[PDB]
Amino acid sequence: AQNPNCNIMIFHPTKEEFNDFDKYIAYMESQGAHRAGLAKIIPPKEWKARETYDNISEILIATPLQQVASGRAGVFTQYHKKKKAMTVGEYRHLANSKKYQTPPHQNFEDLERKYWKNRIYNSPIYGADISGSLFDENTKQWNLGHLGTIQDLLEKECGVVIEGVNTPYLYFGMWKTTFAWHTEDMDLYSINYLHLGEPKTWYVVPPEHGQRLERLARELFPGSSRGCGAFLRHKVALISPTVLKENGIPFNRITQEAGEFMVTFPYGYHAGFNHGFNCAEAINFATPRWIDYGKMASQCSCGEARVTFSMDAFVRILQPERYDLWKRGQD
Numbered sequence: 459a460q461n462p463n464c465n466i467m468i469f470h471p472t473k474e475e476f477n478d479f480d481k482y483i484a485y486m487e488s489q490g491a492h493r494a495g496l497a498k499i500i501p502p503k504e505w506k507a508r509e510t511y512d513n514i515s516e517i518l519i520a521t522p523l524q525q526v527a528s529g530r531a532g533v534f535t536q537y538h539k540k541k542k543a544m545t546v547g548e549y550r551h552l553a554n555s556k557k558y559q560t561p562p563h564q565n566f567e568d569l570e571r572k573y574w575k576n577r578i579y580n581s582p583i584y585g586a587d588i589s590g591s592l593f594d595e596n597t598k599q600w601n602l603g604h605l606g607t608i609q610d611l612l613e614k615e616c617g618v619v620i621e622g623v624n625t626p627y628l629y630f631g632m633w634k635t636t637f638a639w640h641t642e643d644m645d646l647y648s649i650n651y652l653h654l655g656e657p658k659t660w661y662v663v664p665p666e667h668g669q670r671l672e673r674l675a676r677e678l679f680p681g682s683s684r685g686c687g688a689f690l691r692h693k694v695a696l697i698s699p700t701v702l703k704e705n706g707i708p709f710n711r712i713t714q715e716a717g718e719f720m721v722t723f724p725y726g727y728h729a730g731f732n733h734g735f736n737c738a739e740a741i742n743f744a745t746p747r748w749i750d751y752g753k754m755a756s757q758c759s760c761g762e763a764r765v766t767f768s769m770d771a772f773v774r775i776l777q778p779e780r781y782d783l784w785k786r787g788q789d
């Protein structure tokens with residue numbers, strides 16, 4: 459069995475190996491990459507996502523989110539308070555202000571220490587889930603706006619034609635902006651490209667150990683657990699590496715820098731934070747190996763998780779028994 463300790467693997471494809479996306483994903487899995495839940499892909503040196511980022515300031519963040527924390531430093535929830543619209547140029551200036559900017563630090567480890575010590579005492583503003591792309595249309599390799607769609611994968615594998623579309627999303631971050639512990643909708647893959655700016659630190663639990671994280675989360679967030687049998691789908695709960703180590707949960711960590719891709723694999727729980735002003739692009743995708751994970755994915759039916767139009771069909775075809783109750787949650 460390849461990668462039996464479930465370490466995060468890092469890949470350096472050549473320009474020739476960068477042509478066929480599906481084939482490279484299947485290669486990475488042949489080497490065991492999926493066992494970690496997360497992999498890093500460093501693009502060939504010849505490749506570029508676009509020529510420059512000099513003209514992005516007029517993108518609108520229509521609903522910036524202020525991430526307000528509650529709890530203790532290592533075990534907290536966050537709620538998202540909606541703020542007034544602002545441009546990317548305005549958001550960048552805000553990120554760089556004395557109130558919100560990255561503090562002085564020695565290296566990524568010192569910054570990680572400061573994040574876990576101090577996150578709860580501040581409320582950084584995140585521009586999340588903005589439909590759009592920063593890949594140039596002429597970029598033919600690993601262009602997250604030109605991937606094969608999940609609806610077409612389900613059709614190729616299972617023969618059933620369904621409605622829905624699959625498009626990318628932009629994330630504009632600042633120091634302390636936080637992504638809570640989650641897997642993807644329907645336990646899909648994700649791919650994330652850091653277009654510009656400061657790094658993003660990731661934490662991940664191997665898929666084969668995801669239920670260990672779920673059981674800890676039910677202990678640590680006991681009212682949320684009683685409210686919903688899949689409450690990590692709400693994307694609000696944080697648990698620090700120190701707490702995970704104290705409770706024996708297997709995990710790994712890695713820092714993504716500008717110019718690098720990360721892939722999350724089906725049922726790989728992940729969480730993390732941004733080091734300073736940055737812009738990432740991400741999208742979900744599927745392969746043949748995902749289909750069995752989709753059939754088994756938990757669902758939020760309490761009504762909190764409220765998700766895309768396209769997830770309807772996935773539930774309807776892969777989880778017909780749940781369909782009824784899950785749709786009660788979504789209406």
Ligand SMILES: O=C(O)CNC(=O)C(=O)O
Nearest residue numbers: 629637648649650738740
């Ligand atoms: O970058 C972020 O804020 C969160 N992204 C992801 O969870 C992802 O790509 O799967």
Ligand SMILES: [Mg+2]
Nearest residue numbers: 514515516517
């Ligand atoms: Mg612009």
Ligand code: NI
Nearest residue numbers: 641642648728
């Ligand atoms: Ni994710």
Ligand SMILES: [Zn+2]
Nearest residue numbers: 686758760762
């Ligand atoms: Zn719920």
